Symmetry: none
Subunit: 465 residues, 2 copies
């Protein structure tokens, strides 16, 4: 089998994501001194979407949108999967038609390695540290809930990166195993084995590699990656950042005390992404494979007095989004397309030649043409979400345009607050100008209402015209 054989009529897919990875934390973007040589290289061979976002910047909700192509109400994943939200059915539906189900039906070899976080835990909880106490977070994904991912080396959620746990394809619920290796390292090694096994190109394949770092347990990263930032000037990083509290404050110190390890995690993740790319090139599986590097959400880490994410601020919504496909896409410096994490379902499927297979239930944007050609879509506006899992009449709904971030809050069906930021004049979003721009607010109000009605979201009824 040394002779070159027929190229598959549809491309492979290697979907790589790292949890809690901020969009501006990429070296080639030139905004932060974080080292990501492998992602920079990947970007140079493809496209770097510098305005990409995640509409509901929370783990399960974001992943739920990605898999179903539906906004939160429809995906049913309105909050993180854990025992607190379980009674409300917060988990991916076994009946949901996900993009992985589609590719499996189209004859693709399927694999998933890493964090899934789309199953509701139930008693008795599996024996991992994050299941002890009042609230459990980790649960097994039985075969019938894997949506086509036949090769399985994954877990629900678990954050001790230095000794991660996984369930292989045939392991029963209580037979997960621990690995004495950094998560991204092990995951990249298993991804390489999977990729090596696809070298004969007898059929197409789709592989997801879902890494945990740079998600918390920021310090849980190998020392060699920390050494790279031992001389990092943290105070210099806060220069011109009014959104980062001053030194001496709770949140200002939180940012300063964790930024070094956050970058260490990213650089470590970067190196392992490099290993996967190298495996693809070694097996001649890079040119006709769509490789995507993205994240479910960013992180505030003290900025805006917020420690986590789950908020409309840029540091929370902005995510990396690098895509390569040498055979069909010429490299483009930077693309301003406001593609969202959840748009990947219809976008990738259409790019892959399966546009007719996208379910009528999919609500997100099919930006395949924009991605392939680079043709802009200036009218593209993405939504923002926060849904109280036990009371949908409470929460946030908003819109993000290329210039403004607008959001309204409601409590029991009544609008409670209005927020508007002009990111051009106020890039760090420090001035809520909603009360100063009544005309503009009214315009966004009808626009939001129309959006909520289009997506069959009951919240639409709270906006009184």
């Amino acid at each position: 089998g040394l002779q070159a054989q027929e190229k598959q009529p549809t491309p492979n897919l290697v979907f790589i994501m790292a949890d809690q990875y901020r969009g501006d934390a990429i070296g080639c973007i030139g905004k932060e001194p974080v080292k990501t040589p492998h992602l920079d290289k990947l970007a140079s061979e493809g496209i770097n979407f510098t305005n990409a976002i995640s509409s509901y910047p929370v783990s399960s909700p974001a992943r739920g949108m990605l898999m179903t192509g539906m906004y939160p109400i429809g995906s049913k994943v309105t909050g993180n999967c854990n025992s607190e939200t379980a009674p409300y059915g917060v988990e991916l539906s076994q009946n949901a038609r996900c993009w992985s189900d589609v590719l499996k039906d189209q004859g693709y070899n399927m694999g998933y390695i890493g964090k899934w976080h789309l199953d509701a835990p139930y008693k008795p909880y599996v024996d991992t540290y994050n299941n002890r106490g009042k609230v459990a977070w980790n649960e097994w994904c039985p075969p019938e809930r894997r949506h086509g991912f036949d090769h399985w080396i994954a877990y629900g959620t678990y954050d001790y990166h230095l000794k991660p746990m996984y369930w292989n394809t045939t392991a029963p619920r209580d037979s997960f195993y621990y690995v004495n290796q950094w998560g991204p390292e092990y995951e990249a090694s298993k991804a390489i084995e999977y990729i090596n096994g696809q070298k004969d190109q007898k059929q197409p394949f789709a592989l997801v590699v879902s890494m945990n770092p740079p998600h918390t347990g920021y310090e849980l990263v190998p020392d060699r990656y920390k050494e790279i930032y031992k001389d990092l000037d943290v105070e210099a990083l806060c220069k011109g950042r009014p959104d980062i509290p001053a030194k001496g404050t709770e949140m200002g110190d939180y940012f300063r005390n964790n930024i070094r390890n956050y970058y260490a995690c990213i650089t470590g993740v970067d190196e392992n992404v490099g290993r996967i790319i190298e495996a693809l090139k070694q097996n001649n599986l890079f040119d006709n494979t769509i490789v995507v590097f993205t994240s479910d959400h960013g992180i505030c880490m003290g900025a805006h007095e917020n420690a986590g994410k789950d908020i409309f601020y840029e540091e929370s919504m902005r995510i990396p989004m690098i895509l390569s496909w040498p055979d069909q896409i010429k490299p483009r410096k930077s693309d301003p397309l406001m593609i969202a994490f959840a748009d990947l379902y219809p976008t990738l499927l259409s790019m892959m030649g399966f546009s007719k297979e996208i379910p009528e239930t999919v609500q997100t944007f099919d930006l395949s043409n924009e991605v392939l050609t680079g043709k802009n879509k200036k009218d593209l506006v993405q939504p923002y979400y926060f849904v109280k899992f036990d009371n949908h009449a409470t929460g946030y709904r908003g819109l993000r345009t290329d210039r403004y971030t607008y959001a309204v809050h409601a409590t029991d069906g009544k609008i409670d607050n209005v927020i508007l930021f002009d990111r051009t004049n106020d890039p760090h979003e420090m001035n809520n100008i909603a009360s100063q721009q009544l005309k503009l607010t009214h315009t966004f109000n009808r626009q939001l209402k129309t959006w909520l009605e289009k997506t069959n979201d009951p919240f639409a009824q709270y906006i009184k015209l």
Copy 2:
């Protein structure tokens, strides 16, 4: 922020210690009529190590071993810190890699409240009563000598419990302040404020609360605690205690005249420990926090004709050692593990998920597995020390097995005395049987020599094989 958020991958730590607290002075142990309802409750929710000891039962030396994880010669704290030992460098090294430095590096919020006693005083001495006269004992701990403890409300040493003094985090050397409240009361109040501030769980935390009572100034305890023992039958306490001198003697009367107030102090300390535990439970910070209650050493108080400690007798070496961590440790009635005060550095760090961070310089036992599982270590033998600060060739070196206490004394490098007690047949250690057990003494001799050689202790050369 009402929704439950991700559990930290490593636990918090609340290390509580009361100076000069005897191991058997715990109510649930059933040997003495002292009331400790809060510690009894803590024990019931965790583990009570009834054979725990302190190898060098003296304040600074013991604390020095705890912080560095090294035996006395290596820790450099060979005697109490005061102006007499200062010329010999008896103090914690600023360059010593302590467990607190490790946790700080791992992103933990750090706090220390109470007695430190690890700094050598220097002229002009700070203005406290114990610094007047020929020998000064109290000194300030500048920020660079705090080994990572950012939140600081502490002092060197000071024993007038009714009006204690402290230095807050930013106070200069001569700006300490006095408080008109019982030490343990104030300390518990400050610990509660610290704990309340950790409720958002944005990062892990480690807090040390080092209380002075039941250390001398035995009478310096609130009247309400003394009232509890107003009817205590002191003579009954001496029943079956041949180690306690008879009434009418100097040491026999000393024991009888101070036992009531000693218990009063303990009960008072107990109540304040209860306040701290309650704060942890109120903030949902008890289940995933390792809580430790221990002491640097016990006290003879007249027993064996000794007023103080700094000796191999059980009443001096035995210390309380209660540990709880609901999320990972099921309660165990009593554990016979002979864990030592100084073993907490490697033991806690490994239990917390930072085994790889223990310096190669650490010499004490890592008993994390034993503590977590309850798996015994029958071969565990702990050392005993007494080092003459101005002449290391003089002093004691010994071993404590589950049955025997063996010790040898040397003067200028020559063995001066041999002591051996069979605690099974002679629990109150009244019969030195060394001269009657030559075979056994020879066995312990080689065992001691091997121990001293392993720990790079020059005293090893004095034992002539």
